[PDB]
Design a protein around this nucleic acid. Sequence first.
RNA 1: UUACUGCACAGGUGACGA
DNA 2: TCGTCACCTGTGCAGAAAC
Length: 758
Amino acid sequence: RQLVSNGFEVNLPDQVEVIVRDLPDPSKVKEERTRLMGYWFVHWFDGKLFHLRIKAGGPNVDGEHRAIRTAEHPWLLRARLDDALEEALPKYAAVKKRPFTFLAQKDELIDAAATAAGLSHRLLNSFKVIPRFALSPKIYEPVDGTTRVGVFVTIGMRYDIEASLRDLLEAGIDLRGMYVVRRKRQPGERGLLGRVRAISDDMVQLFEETDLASVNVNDAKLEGSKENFTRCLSALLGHNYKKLLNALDDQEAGYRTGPRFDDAVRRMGEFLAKKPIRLADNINAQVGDRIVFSNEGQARNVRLAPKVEYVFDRTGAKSAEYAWRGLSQFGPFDRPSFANRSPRILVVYPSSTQGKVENFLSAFRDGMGSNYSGFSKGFVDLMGLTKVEFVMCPVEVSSADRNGAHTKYNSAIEDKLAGAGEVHAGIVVLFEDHARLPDDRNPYIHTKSLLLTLGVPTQQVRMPTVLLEPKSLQYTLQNFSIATYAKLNGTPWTVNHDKAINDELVVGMGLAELSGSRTEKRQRFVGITTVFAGDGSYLLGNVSKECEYEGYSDAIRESMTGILRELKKRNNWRPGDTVRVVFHAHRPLKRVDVASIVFECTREIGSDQNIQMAFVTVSHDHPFVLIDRSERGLEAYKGSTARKGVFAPPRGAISRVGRLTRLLAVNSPQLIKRANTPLPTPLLVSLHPDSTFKDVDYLAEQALKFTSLSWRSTLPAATPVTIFYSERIAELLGRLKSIPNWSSANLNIKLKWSRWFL
RNA sequence: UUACUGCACAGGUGACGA
DNA sequence: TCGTCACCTGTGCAGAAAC
Ligand SMILES: [Mg+2]
């Protein structure tokens, strides 16, 4: 019947008296806030400074004396609530403001973990993991037409390595190449200093430096990354350290699992409710009941989307709840039409790995048999092909060769392909030690570049993957097979839709930001992916080949107008037909870009048809969480006492926050990984207010379906493929732009129907 | 770079206004 | 150029595999 939030109602006065000055230049605002500090709350909005007296006595303020009604203008008290919450918790110091963020006063999980695991070390007490709370005042709509303010509670963990760098040297930990940060960030100061080159004498020598190439051991500390935590702890404890991490993980589950998180939110609400929260001397807020999403009374704030159907034929009759179950029993969506039933695949690999690579190829092509039910049949039988021919391309290269590996791979490929005729795809095997070399010598990106230039898509793989134990390998080969088939132009599966309008186009844009190191300013690139409504199905369209960030709005509009022109041509729209266009991204578009896109699409389709357009943001990092108290969870595995996904809403749960915004649950108890996996965060789906198509519940369910459309994996993706695929394209193309001899010429010729970016 | 998931850290950045 | 509300992206480690 209902979903519980992590937020509480805040009962506010109906009205507050304020003084208003015209203040066309916001530059004056800082001086005025300083001058009135203590007696007035000050807030600039729409060219006017608003003044709310908090404490009696001067200084004075001129301007009109207006009443601000909370139901009408909740932004004023929402903002004041940010400062008031801090003030109301004076013993809990702010580590951040707006939203107010602070640490647990006594809890420290490393100490508790160590005691539980039975471990000890004299330096453990300088490694700290402390619960961190934020209280976010947010405007929401308990029903359409009415706004309220709630306070939303979120929990994370502060990871911090307090230890002296001198102390870490002497304990035997190699600090070279570790990132280091300032101990005391002064007001506008950046944190990152650089990487440890050497420790001189009360001085750190730095490379990849952000400012000075050296600094005192006293002004620096290791950044609180998992990399630095694991590097230190494994040397100080290893291999007992893993037991500590499991122990630490158990501690954190005491704050982050459903029932524990729900209890922490409860205890926070109780604490905040105990006293009135002072907005001004005679003006009070009271924190109230937990905010819920329900269909009680005149509220209609929760619904459950139907299960997505994975579709394996053009009729719709062949469908499944899960991708792998469906693929196994039906074969792929395009089996009747798939042109190349005997693909030739180039296999490029270090000559010393020959035996391990043959074992992997055999498992891949011919299957693992019935002892490994995740991958019994093999690629050929799975996908309904006649055979696969491997063209073996050994490379004389060692893992220790960090400067010449890329040149050897590419020479071997060129020499093999010159006397071997046409290949339809490649598998490229890489050493782990080469995987993340700089792009000027990285074999992944150089082989990707050469083969894509030649029109040959590749599926690359690292040796640790090639060596996975059979129980794990079977799942790797599922995912590997799906992407390889799509790289060969295949369509593994589609997802259902019922035709409600005559045509529908969804376009997504995704961002990548590339640099050679953290020091170097990241350059932005974009990708564009298109998806079309089919009869019973969503179909993947063509993808961008140009990736420049400059002018991305023009690229969106060109992609849409050209595609609309071609869909109209193919489908021969009748007068009065409705066409719907949807845009997906992780950030909102500018109003002026929405206007331009609407104008151009409308002109292209013309006055014979009715057009509906929606612009949608999908957000992962926001302060909302959904709790389903009726969800008991599922056994963590067959058949333990532990549970996973306790209080996790079902996949496809959609909650109404406001007119323009829905919360979408994607990670159900089934999909949730382990007993200690936190209560998931839902996706926030936001409609651009200038959209002509207004149905955000439909748009949220559509985003859900598009998570299931990913051909990178059998499991669904974290975000709809319209965005996800675009980010992969942006990253690959932006990287390739810097690689000598790269050409995009074949991306719209031999690779036009290849899903080469998976 | 089989991937899904989670977390952490760092960098900042976007949109709306006047 | 600024106020205001908001959260994006990259990197690295570790546990699982929607029946
Ligand atoms: Mg891939």
